[PDB]
Ligand binder design. Structure first.
Ligand SMILES: NC(=O)c1ccc[n+]([C@@H]2O[C@H](COP(=O)([O-])OP(=O)(O)OC[C@H]3O[C@@H](n4cnc5c(N)ncnc54)[C@H](O)[C@@H]3O)[C@@H](O)[C@H]2O)c1
Length: 308
């Protein structure tokens, strides 16, 4: 029995379906703040900070494995730092405390946001000092440390990935900083114009959702004794600037992109351009399959369909 928190967000939208297909619909429970409709999966509403309800859901459904995706993201968290700490840190602590009680296995993702400007910007190593300059990054570092304490001190099998910016078409993201890449696709197809909230040179690690979902499932399936890292694997696929994405998209559809930076520039400026993920590659056989042009094909084909 598997529970997915944050089930209705960008990752959860695709992860729930992937898990239902791998394990059976009889095995999957979804959860988020507000009940949706026309929803195929079994669903239980819960605020991640409400420990009594969270625990009830886990024991009533006999949850043995939790994929914990509930969070406030970088840009929303910069504007509301108190809420970002509360949901991200106290929410995770709730998940980990419950995992200890019920002897659960966990997937608790981190982020490239753990890194700050003091470390190498290209091919950032696994083990560098973590000095993030965002509220959200700070919560992710504290979360990595808390997760690794539950593994070492309490024997909880908790695994996680420092995801790069994730690009998908099934669910448009809306509180982050890497969001411009998805927004640029949606707006290019829907209206042939986009106003980008970072400058044209902003260069960040990116990954297509298929790859991110597959990595998550592969890492969860690995034998525990093959892993040299737990909460916080580096993971890599692509790196490009905003104008480089604009150009890739322009080879498929007419659009004009205007660049109008806001506060989210300050967030992105503090992050790396690319990530060394050799440990994932070595420990559990990670390789990405989607480069920029394959990703672009998938995005445009599916967005054109959805706009017919
Ligand atoms: N590019 C990316 O998408 C990316 C990159 C790196 C890390 N991550 C991490 O992956 C995880 C999922 O990210 P996502 O992009 O799918 O985010 P998302 O914001 O799309 O989804 C998160 C979900 O958490 C829910 N949530 C918010 N506050 C809550 C609360 N108090 N209680 C219960 N649920 C609450 C929201 O309703 C939302 O559906 C997060 O841990 C995030 O930090 C994502």
């Amino acid at each position: 029995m598997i529970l997915v928190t944050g089930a209705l967000g960008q990752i959860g939208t695709e992860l729930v379906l992937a898990l239902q297909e791998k394990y059976g619909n009889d095995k999957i429970i979804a959860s988020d703040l507000k009940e949706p409709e026309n929803y195929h999966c079994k669903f239980e509403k819960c605020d991640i900070r409400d420990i009594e309800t969270y625990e009830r859901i886990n024991n009533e459904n006999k949850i043995e494995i939790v994929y914990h995706l509930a969070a406030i993201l970088s840009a929303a968290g910069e504007k509301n730092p108190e809420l970002c700490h509360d949901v991200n840190y106290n929410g995770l602590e709730n998940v980990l405390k419950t995992a200890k009680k019920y002897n659960q296995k966990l997937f608790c993702p981190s982020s490239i946001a753990v890194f700050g400007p003091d470390v190498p910007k290209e091919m950032t190593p696994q083990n560098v000092e973590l000095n993030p300059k965002t509220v959200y990054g700070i919560t992710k570092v504290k979360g990595e440390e808390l997760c690794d304490t539950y593994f070492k001190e309490h024997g909880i099998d908790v695994r996680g990935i420092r995801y790069p910016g994730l690009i998908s078409w099934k669910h448009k993201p809306s509180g982050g900083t890497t969001d411009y890449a998805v927004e640029m696709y949606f707006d290019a197809v829907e209206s042939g114009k986009y106003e980008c909230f970072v400058n044209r040179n902003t260069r960040l690690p990116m990954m297509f959702m298929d790859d991110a979902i597959r990595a998550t499932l592969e890492l969860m399936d690995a034998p525990l004794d093959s892993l040299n890292y737990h909460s916080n694997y580096n993971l890599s696929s692509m790196s490009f600037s905003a104008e480089e994405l604009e150009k890739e998209i322009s080879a498929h559809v007419d659009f004009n992109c205007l660049y109008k930076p806001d506060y989210r520039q300050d967030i992105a400026d503090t992050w790396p351009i690319s990530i060394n993920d050799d440990d994932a590659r070595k420990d559990w056989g990670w390789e990405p399959k989607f480069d920029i042009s394959k990703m672009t094909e998938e995005m445009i084909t599916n967005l054109r369909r959805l706009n017919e």
